[PDB]
Amino acid sequence: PTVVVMDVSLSMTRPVSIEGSEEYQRKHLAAHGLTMLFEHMATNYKLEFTALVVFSSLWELMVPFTRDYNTLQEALSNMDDYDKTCLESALVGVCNIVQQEWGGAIPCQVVLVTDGCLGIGRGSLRHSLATQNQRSESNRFPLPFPFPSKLYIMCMANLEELQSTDSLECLERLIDLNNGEGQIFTIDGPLCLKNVQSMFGKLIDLAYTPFHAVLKCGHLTADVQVFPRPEPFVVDEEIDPIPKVINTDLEIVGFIDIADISSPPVLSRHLVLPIALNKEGDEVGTNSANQIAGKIPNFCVLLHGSLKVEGMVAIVQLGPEWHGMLYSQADSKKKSNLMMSLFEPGPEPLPWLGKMAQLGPISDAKENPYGEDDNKSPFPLQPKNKRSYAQNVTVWIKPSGLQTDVQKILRNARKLPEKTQTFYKELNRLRKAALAFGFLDLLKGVADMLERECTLLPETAHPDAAFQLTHAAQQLKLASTGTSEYAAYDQNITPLHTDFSGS
C-alpha cells in the first residue's frame, strides 16, 4: 500500500517562480505531481491501496486506504491552507493507519510531498531530529517505520533553495533514519510543472512499475501480471548475498492436492492476472481493447477454474532451488481469482513434501500412490525420527507425572492375566526409566505396591494373577539393587509361562 503525506502548510503557498515564469504555488505543483501519480496508478497499478494524509500544525487522514483514485484525485482540488509544519506527528499517524489496516509485515511506500520548509520551534523537523534520543518509548521517533517501508520525499523546492537553508540535510537525515530505504527527489534547476512531472515520472518508474511475467504449463502460456511486485529477497548476507528475483518464465512443474500441501508457510502472496500484449510488448495501449482480449481464450482462466474445481495447487519454479504454488481463493463466499504464493528459497521448504527436485510424475511410479479410487496419498512424508509427543517418553519431574505411570501399572495389575502384555510393558517402561535416572528407590517402592496388590487380590480372581504380581515384584527388587541382574537396561522382566490355559 501507499500513504501520501502532503504538506499543506503556509510555506506551500509561496510562488513557484518569483520571476513569474509560472503562476503555480508550491501546493499547485504538488497537486499536479500527485495527479500524475494517481493517474498512473488508476491504469497500471489498479490494485494498490492508497491513503492521503495532510499535515500542518495538525495532521488529518483525508482519504483512508482505497483503490478509488478518482476520490484521491478529487481530494487534491481546492485544498485548504494552514500554518506551521509538524512532520513528526504526521509520521506517527502514518505508523498508526498502516498497522491498523495491514499489520506490520506488508510493505508500504510513504510518499512525502513538501517544500522542505519545516521551520524552527516545537513541531519543526530540525528540533525533532535533534531530540531523537530522548523520551525513549513514551515518545519514540516514528522512523524507522515498524513495517517494511520506502520513504520517498518529493521536494517542492529546487536544490539551490534546499541547500541555502540546511533544509535538505534534515530531509536526508529522515531517509538515513529509515535505514536508507527511500530516496530524495529534487530538481537541480527551475521549479516548474515540466520538472515536477519528470520528478514524479521517476518515482513512477522506481516504485510503481508493474511486474510482467509469462505463466507456462508446458506449451500452455499466458502473459501475466504479478501483483504486488515481489520484493527482492536476500537469504543470508554471509552465505548467499545476491538478492533473489523470481524467474520471468513462471514454469509449472506439477500439481498437488490442497490437503497435501496443507497450509504451507510462504513469503508472500500475489495475484496473477493476464495482460493483453501486442507486437512490441506494449500492453494494448494501456473498452474495445478489453472486449477483444475478453473473447480470446486465456490459460489463466482455464488454470484458475480447474484449480478451484479440483481443489489443487500448481507448483511453480521461481528459480534454481526456489519454488512456489498457484491456487484459487479458498474461501468460497469471497470473490475468487488466480494467485501465487512464494515458498522459502531452498531445496526443502516443506518437510512433509521432501526435496522439491525429487517430486516426480506418478507415471514413473510402479503403482499410483494416490490409489485407484484416489483414496490414498504419498503425503505427508514423515520425519525419520518421532517427536516426544508422538512417542512414549518418561517425565517424573512433577509428582503427578510419576503417579500417572504407577497408576497405569496398578490398573493393569488388577486385570491379569488379561492385560499381561501391557502390564509388563508399562512395568519395564518404569524399570528402564528408573535405571536411567538413577532412581532405584522407586523400584523398591513399586515392588512393595505390587506385593500389596497381590495380597489384596479378591478370592474371585484368576489364579495366574498372584503368580505374575509376585514375579514382577520380586524381579523389580532385584533390579533396584544395582548388582547385575535385571539392573541391566536391556534385560526385560518376562512373565511366567503358567500352564493355566487348556493343555
Binding site: 506490520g104 506449451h219 495475484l271 492476472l273 489463466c300 482455464l302 517430486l359 516426480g360 517427536r387 505396591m449
Partner: protein
Amino acid sequence: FMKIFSESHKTVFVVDHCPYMAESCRQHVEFDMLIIPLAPISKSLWTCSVESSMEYCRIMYDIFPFKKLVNFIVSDSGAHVLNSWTQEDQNLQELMAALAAVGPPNPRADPECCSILHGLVAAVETLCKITEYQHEARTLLMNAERVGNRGRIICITNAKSDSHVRMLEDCVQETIHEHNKLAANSDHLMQIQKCELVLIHTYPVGEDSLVSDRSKKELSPVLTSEVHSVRAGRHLATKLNILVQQHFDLASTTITNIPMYDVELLHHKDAHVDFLETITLKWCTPRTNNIELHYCTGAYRISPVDVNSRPSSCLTNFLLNGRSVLLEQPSKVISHMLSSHGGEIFLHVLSSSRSILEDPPSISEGCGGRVTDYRITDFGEFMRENRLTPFLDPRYKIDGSLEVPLERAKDQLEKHTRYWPMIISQTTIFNMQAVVPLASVIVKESLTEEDVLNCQKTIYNLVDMERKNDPLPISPKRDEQYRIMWNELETLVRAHINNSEKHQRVLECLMACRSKP
C-alpha cells in the same frame, strides 16, 4: 560470525558423578495414593540434575530436529562423553541407556580425584571438534573458512563455596586458552571463538545455599561465565526450563478452552513476532468443513511443556490423529493454527489483517473472461494425472548422468500439452469418446504393444464411424466433418512421431485409413 553456528549450535552438558551427588534432595515424592500408605521417597541430587537436563534436551530436540547439537558428559574420577556431535547421536533413547550404564553415584565410594574438572576439560576439548554441519561449511568456503565456532557449557554440580566456584571458572578459562593453541595448529580442530559457561549449583531443600548467585562476568574475550544457586527437585527443573527458553529464543503459548485444563507449548519466538510472559490463545471449535488452504506467513515446530499431562496429551493426540485447531486471541480474531504434518506438530501463523489482494478483478472482465466453453473438466483430469509424488532412491530408464524426477515431471507436461485445445469449440477429437484410447497413450514416451493395438483399434473404429456416417461434435458437411476430424487426429499423432518408431507406425496406420487427403 556464522548464523547457524552461534552459541546454541554446540551445547555440552557436564554433570558430576561423584559420591556426594547421591545425597537426597529431601523433597518427598508421593507415589502411593491410598490400608497403611507407603512412606514417601526422595530423589538424589544426581537424579534431579539428570531429570532436568534430559527435559532440557527433550524440548530442544522437538523444536530443533537439526543443527542444534548436544554432547552429554558425566564427570567423576574421569570424563565420559555419552554421545558425539553427529546428528545420529542426538537421540534421547540412547542417552538414557548410557545414563543407565553409568548408574547412580555410589555413596560409599572413593571420593578422591573425583571432580567436576574432568568433564569441564572434556567440554572444552569437544567444543574444538568439528561437527558435521561445520565440516560441510568448511568444505564449501575452502570466503575461505570464516566459519564460526561457538558453544555453551551447562554444568550442574554441588560446589563447596564461592571460592570453589571461582576456581572452576578459572580452570575453564585457562583450559580454553591453552587448548585453543593446540586447536589452531591442528588440521581437524577449531578454536573456540566464544563460549558461555553456565554453572548451576544445586543442593537439597531445607538447607542454606553455600554458593551465591552471580550474573554474567567476562572472564576472557572468549569465555563468559555465570553461576546459579537453586534448590534441587522442582526448583532445579524450573531453572533449566527457563534456561532452554533463553538459550534458543523460545516463546510460550498457552492454549485455553480445550474441551475434553490449559496447555502450554514452547516454540521459537518468531511465531509471535507478527502479533507484537505467555500468549493465551483460545481453542476455536473446529467447524466440520472449514477453509482447507490457509495463508500462512510462518510455521514453527512446538514442544509441550507437560508432554505427559492429560490436557496436553489430549491436545497433542487430537492433532496427531489428523485434525487441526484454530486459535483465537481474546467479531473475533483467529491468528494461529496448530496442525500435524506426518506426526510433527507445527504452529502456523495466520493473517488477521485486511488482505491487500481482497476484491480481486473479475475473471469475467479480464482476458478470456467472455469465453464460455473452457475445458475445465478435462483440464481438471489433466491436473490429477500430473500430480507429483516423492521419489526416494535415484532412478533412471537408460544410463548416464542421473535423471531428476522434477525434470521428468516438467518434461511430461511438455508432451501432454503439445496439442491441448483449451476450449470445446476448438476441438473435435477431444469431444469424441472413441478417440480416448489413442489420445491417452499417444503422448507417452514409448508405446507398449497393447498401446499400439488400441491406437489401431481407435483408427479402425473411426473408419467404421465414417462409413456409417455417424455425426461428429465439430462445433459442416458430413464429408467435411471427417476431413477436419482426420486432420486434427493427424495433427495430434504427428506431434509425437519422434517419440518412437511405434509412433511412426501409428501414423502410417492413420494415413492409410483416413479419407483420401
